Amino acid sequence: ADDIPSFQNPNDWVFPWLTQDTIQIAEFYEVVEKKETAFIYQDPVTGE
Amino acid sequence: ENRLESILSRFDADWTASDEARREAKNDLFFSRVSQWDDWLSQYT
Amino acid sequence: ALNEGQIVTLAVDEIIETISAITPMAQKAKKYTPPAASMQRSSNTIWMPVEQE
Amino acid sequence: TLAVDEIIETISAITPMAQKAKKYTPPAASMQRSSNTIWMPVEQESPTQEGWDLTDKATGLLELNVAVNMGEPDNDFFQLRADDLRDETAYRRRIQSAARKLANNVELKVANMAAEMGSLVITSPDAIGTNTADAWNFVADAEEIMFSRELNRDMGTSYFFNPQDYKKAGYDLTKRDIFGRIPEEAYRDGTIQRQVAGFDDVLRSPKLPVLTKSTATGITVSGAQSFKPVAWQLDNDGNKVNVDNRFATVTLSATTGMKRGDKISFAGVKFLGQMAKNVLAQDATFSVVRVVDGTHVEITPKPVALDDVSLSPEQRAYANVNTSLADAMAVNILNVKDARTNVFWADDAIRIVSQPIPANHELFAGMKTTSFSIPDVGLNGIFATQGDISTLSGLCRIALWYGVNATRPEAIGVGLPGQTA
Numbered sequence: 001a002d003d004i005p006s007f008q009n010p011n012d013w014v015f016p017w018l019t020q021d022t023i024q025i026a027e028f029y030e031v032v033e034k035k036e037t038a039f040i041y042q043d044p045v046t047g048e
Numbered sequence: 049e050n051r052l053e054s055i056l057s058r059f060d061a062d063w064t065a066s067d068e069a070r071r072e073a074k075n076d077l078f079f080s081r082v083s084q085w086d087d088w089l090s091q092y093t
Numbered sequence: 094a095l096n097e098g099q100i101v102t103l104a105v106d107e108i109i110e111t112i113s114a115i116t117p118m119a120q121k122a123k124k125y126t127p128p129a130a131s132m133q134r135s136s137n138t139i140w141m142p143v144e145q146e
Numbered sequence: 147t148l149a150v151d152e153i154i155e156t157i158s159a160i161t162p163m164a165q166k167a168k169k170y171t172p173p174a175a176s177m178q179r180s181s182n183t184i185w186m187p188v189e190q191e192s193p194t195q196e197g198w199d200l201t202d203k204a205t206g207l208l209e210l211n212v213a214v215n216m217g218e219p220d221n222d223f224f225q226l227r228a229d230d231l232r233d234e235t236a237y238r239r240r241i242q243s244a245a246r247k248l249a250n251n252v253e254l255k256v257a258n259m260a261a262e263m264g265s266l267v268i269t270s271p272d273a274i275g276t277n278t279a280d281a282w283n284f285v286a287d288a289e290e291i292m293f294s295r296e297l298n299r300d301m302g303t304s305y306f307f308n309p310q311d312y313k314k315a316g317y318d319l320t321k322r323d324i325f326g327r328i329p330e331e332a333y334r335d336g337t338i339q340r341q342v343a344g345f346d347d348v349l350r351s352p353k354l355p356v357l358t359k360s361t362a363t364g365i366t367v368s369g370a371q372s373f374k375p376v377a378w379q380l381d382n383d384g385n386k387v388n389v390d391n392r393f394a395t396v397t398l399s400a401t402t403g404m405k406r407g408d409k410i411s412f413a414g415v416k417f418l419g420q421m422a423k424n425v426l427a428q429d430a431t432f433s434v435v436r437v438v439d440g441t442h443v444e445i446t447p448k449p450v451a452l453d454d455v456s457l458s459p460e461q462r463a464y465a466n467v468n469t470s471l472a473d474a475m476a477v478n479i480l481n482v483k484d485a486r487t488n489v490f491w492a493d494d495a496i497r498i499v500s501q502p503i504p505a506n507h508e509l510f511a512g513m514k515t516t517s518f519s520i521p522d523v524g525l526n527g528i529f530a531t532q533g534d535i536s537t538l539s540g541l542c543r544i545a546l547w548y549g550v551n552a553t554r555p556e557a558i559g560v561g562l563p564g565q566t567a
Contacts, residue, residue: 015128018125019123019125026059028058049106064508088128088129091128091129092131095205095207097208097209097376098209100377100388
């Protein structure tokens with residue numbers, strides 16, 4: 001928390017009188033489509 | 049190669065691509081919510 | 094040996110950081126954003142009152 | 147004043163050489179830092195020693211290279227006035243004509259470079275229409291000089307006639323007093339044949355240059371000279387800088403009357419069998435590329451001597467000329483008379499490097515940049531438009547950044563009929 005972050009401000013010059021005194025950070029979501037190993041078990045109750 | 053640089057490049061590309069629509073949408077929100085008089089360049093009177 | 098081959102130059106792009114400064118006073122100072130574009134004339138200033146005694 | 151939209155089309159040009167030339171698009175990101183120059187290796191030739199005891203006779207490895215680069219954009223800048231009506235009537239047709247002219251310019255650059263950096267030179271003492279099958283002999287001389295030198299022709303070969311010599315070949319075919327299949331084709335149409343004397347693509351080209359004669363005479367080599375194959379050499383700072391393999395600066399008595407494009411041949415130097423290193427019966431021909439200073443020139447085939455004792459065995463493995471220059475060897479000029487050049491080559495000898503002009507960047511605001519695909523020649527340029535009211539007009543610019551390169555000047559050739567007098 002001591003290391004205050006910063007990022008591209010989406011609110012350029014809010015114009016009442018004074019700034020919101022805010023802190024900006026970002027969350028980057030990324031989707032990776034890939035083949036991963038799957039295990040074929042046998043269900044002890046029923047079903048292959 | 050740098051993860052920071054790759055993320056920043058992607059973000060900057062999208063940010064500069066969506067620049068006009070975002071500006072128009074922000075102007076629409078301000079117009080519909082706060083005030084319809086945007087007069088700060090008119091301060092010469 | 095005497096392998097008189099081909100010579101290239103490899104400029105790779107992992108930069109070497111050298112500068113890391115801090116701004117402890119500007120962050121503490123409050124920011125203001127008035128909508129007055131006439132201040133370019135430098136004779137147009139904002140007047141604010143002082144607490145009365 | 148009655149006026150219509152009907153267009154009286156006036157010109158229709160063909161671009162076979164630019165179409166056939168391979169087009170290269172190396173990465174622009176690397177080319178920006180590499181000063182628009184990229185190096186490619188050359189097929190390696192190995193030496194050979196026979197014997198039993200070979201102590202302290204182990205050679206090294208040497209692989210030479212060439213470099214390809216580009217020139218400057220070939221634009222179509224023009225200003226267009228909004229109020230005028232003859233400009234609104236002509237804007238789009240002007241754009242189309244600009245595309246056609248850019249393609250024509252690319253073809254002209256290809257033809258001139260091929261005819262000016264063509265090492266192999268075939269010459270005739272008279273016109274093509276002199277003796278029967280003289281056009282066939284002209285093509286066969288080129289095919290034989292490519293065969294004897296053992297030049298790689300896997301991609302294919304090509305021969306471009308000029309229209310006059312093509313007509314002469316057709317006339318020779320049709321005056322045969324017989325009509326089989328080739329004579330009937332040459333009668334009904336002007337085409338001689340699609341393949342002649344071993345070439346797999348024989349065409350005619352309206353944009354082949356005319357090689358103006360050289361006034362140079364009485365020139366001899368000044369000082370015995372030796373040219374050594376090498377890949378890199380040390381500069382002033384000790385750094386190794388690469389060396390191009392398709393150039394050699396010779397010192398003559400006086401380079402007066404020489405220009406870029408003349409063909410020379412020293413008295414005594416003979417071609418070699420490249421791979422086998424067998425002395426041929428043909429004089430070695432070189433093309434002067436650049437006339438630097440007043441007593442030096444730059445010839446495109448580097449004359450590596452088989453009999454040079456200052457060459458290491460790996461360097462001598464690349465020898466293409468049976469001897470060196472000996473301070474008095476008279477140089478004979480081959481183009482002693484004007485002639486429109488016929489040009490033959492191997493299909494993998496001329497390439498066209500191309501690069502994009504990234505004017506779509508956010509830097510260039512206020513002007514609109516799009517792409518522009520040139521027809522005929524398969525190239526890309528940019529089409530950029532800006533406005534102005536200081537003159538109440540608009541500027542349109544069609545830019546194209548490319549460069550023709552002759553990677554194997556020893557593969558390209560030049561045919562010169564009627565080099566008498």
